[PDB]
Symmetry: D2
Subunit: 251 residues, 4 copies
């Protein structure tokens, strides 16, 4: 039988490209989404046209709350339900906006979204994934290459990403005896936010030493595919920058 993978925030952009490649590689996928129902479904439609009954969707808010644990257990159950197994978890879903330290959402809501999506939900999905277990089990967390050169006023986001590094390493250590590997892919700039101004996107583009451009989503997905593959079987607790050298560049 073919392995199955969960990819969070998989309706669009990097998470979409990750789902697609895992699928092209032979996985069945659970495409998780929060708000993008329509996009999640048309992706599943497209993958199930290629290969019948190989893609399902799964809706969940990953904001931290009293139900998040249940929600995350249900994401992992959906995969077990659809496909009878869960081999791979990609923690890609992420909320992202500025939370300036010095003066909309209340601060406690910002904590819940930024820390819940970037770190608490990953921890709870990891728990549920491991609890439910020639197989090749792994987890890939979508990290941040620039996490030690944080953006101005993005302190909660940055806290969540740093937490996610902690989880990556802690979970690699603790789940090694189960044969579950835990790694990370850390983009620098890849697809820039649809919202982001065009001059603002070019500013970032021009700082990238390898080609003065952003990574494609597919280039990010390549690292993921490597990490879940049989050729990464001794690798756990490793976070691979896919940043074109951006992190190396001084102010």
């Amino acid at each position: 039988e073919a392995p199955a993978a969960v990819v969070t925030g998989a309706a669009k952009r990097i998470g979409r490209a990750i789902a697609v490649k895992l699928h092209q590689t032979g996985y069945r996928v659970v495409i998780h989404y929060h708000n993008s129902a329509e996009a999640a479904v048309s992706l599943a439609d497209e993958l199930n046209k290629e290969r019948s009954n190989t893609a399902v969707v799964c809706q969940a808010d990953l904001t931290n709350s009293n139900v998040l644990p249940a929600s995350c257990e249900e994401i992992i159950n959906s995969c077990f339900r659809a496909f009878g197994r869960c081999d791979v978890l990609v923690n890609n879903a992420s909320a992202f906006y500025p939370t300036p330290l010095v003066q909309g959402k209340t601060v406690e809501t910002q904590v819940a979204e930024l820390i819940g999506t970037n770190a608490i939900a990953p921890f709870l999905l990891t728990m549920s994934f491991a609890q439910r277990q020639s197989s090749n089990l792994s987890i890939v967390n979508l990290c941040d290459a620039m996490v030690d050169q944080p953006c101005m006023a993005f302190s909660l986001y940055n806290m969540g990403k740093h937490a996610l590094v902690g989880l990556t390493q802690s979970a690699a250590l603790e789940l090694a005896p189960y044969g579950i590997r835990v790694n990370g892919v850390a983009p620098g700039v890849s697809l820039l936010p649809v919202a982001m101004g065009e001059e603002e996107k070019d500013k970032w583009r021009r700082k990238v030493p390898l080609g003065r451009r952003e990574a494609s989503a597919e280039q990010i997905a390549d690292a993921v595919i490597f990490l879940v593959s049989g050729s990464a079987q001794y690798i756990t607790g490793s976070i691979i920058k896919v940043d074109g050298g951006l992190s190396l560049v001084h102010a």
Copy 2:
């Protein structure tokens, strides 16, 4: 007029040592505490016997909740109420216990406490400190072993990682205000009251420099360095006080 410091979890152990040392250097101090009220007031008494009207206590749960932001603001407000200023904030309070990934409290509670004390409360207290504004600085009690995590401590460890993020993020954003943010990262220091001597000795034996844990004073010494005029250009630095522990391989 004397500067003022807030030290969280200051009723005993390392936080008491940081407040004692801050007091000896001439700070007025707020001794924040959660459950250890007797130890808190007993300390504020010793300190006020030494110079009167220079220590107050302040009780607060720093578990994450929707009122944690108010609570952290009230902590900063307590320092201005007592002393008319707030120059230093030391984030020392921390919950710690195992949270195994494969299986007491609910997990929602473990999240709230481990992440809230180690990370969210430090962020809120930082916002509050900065919003209320010399030599202004913040010092976070980090973990020298943060990149070699203890088995089954993932939520604690996530919290100490996030506290690194904050140290770095806040140092960048608060620089324009002349507010420095740095950290102090013990290895093993005072071991927990729960721990038996045999398990303490197991950790002691791992330390290259002397095969013993840091004294609480030794941690406080580095905090005192970082708040001083001698570290005026230092911000975003996290100083290990670990006697070489983090350098030792498995």
Copy 3:
């Protein structure tokens, strides 16, 4: 036409596995070696029996000296002489042995060998490589345990640390020329011939993932990924291949 790679210290162990895999992937290979002459020609025989005119050997001492820059230029010149091009450089050769800080090679020789092989030759090889210039990249064999040094291996460790800086500096400088520079950082892979069986086991039992060292093939897999088209945006990255070993506190 087929791309070509130079692999240093490729006659045995990890470097051999890398040469083999690069060769299986479609590459022509320069097999560099120092002393291991028989195993080197033996490997090119195998390779060339599989695909004629796709491997050549190239002998060089990579100890630091005033002629190293010439020896390194010759290694790259040899790749061009044999194959008309040089797409990939792998810096794998390395000397390793204790150099205690406190009391039959002289210390000037220990410096030249350990820093030579592990750092200066890589630098010189990278200069010569870039000077002669498609998916062009370089891979350095680094050490996952580098921030957790082995006792009395300061010179070796210094070499590996330097190789980190080289990886990163060269990534930065060569990016405009389309040349990527990355690392693979084993923990414990095939353990030395001369290592006792008790001390091998001792390292094996430390590894979380599977309680065993990596196979050379496992290391090579990560090299293969980094030179491949699935890594076209990766530069300046160092990928640990250590089964979690570096995550384990003392």
Copy 4:
């Protein structure tokens, strides 16, 4: 009676400021120097005017060669000849200039100067220091906050400073049983070349979060003083950035 320190490259700029403050703290000093005899001597004169017979000067090229280990043994020995003891070693001397990868010093000379001064001499000085011990003994190495965001075309310099981090950690571990601590100070930008145009100096100053300026040599010296003091007695293997947050600033 009074403890003794060796400071390499102590005739000007940072090393001088370090030697002055150690002296002000009550150390006797060996002022090592390469070409700057006149500043070295003039400092030793200023210092011996404060306290008779508490400063000596000691010339040596710290370029890697066959003689470098003797020279480094000689620098240590001279502190013992002058003061009867050697309590503190500061590795401050450093060559610094571009060594581009692609196109009158030859490259073997560049290697010898940049690697010798920034790494190899520090190592040899450490072993001579330790050999002679076998009281608060420690070693402070002058590192670089920016070592992971290197300046373009300084690979040999950068490689030396990276090697110097490894030595700081390696020596800390190996010499801990002798009660010798080994730590670093890692400036970001400090005293800038007086020759450099102010306009160019300002581009660097403007990047520094804290104060938009470079560190004084005295500010670097303060961290060195902390690290050799009785208030750092459990500290070893640590590298204190003194950088005004410069290393936290993305491109």
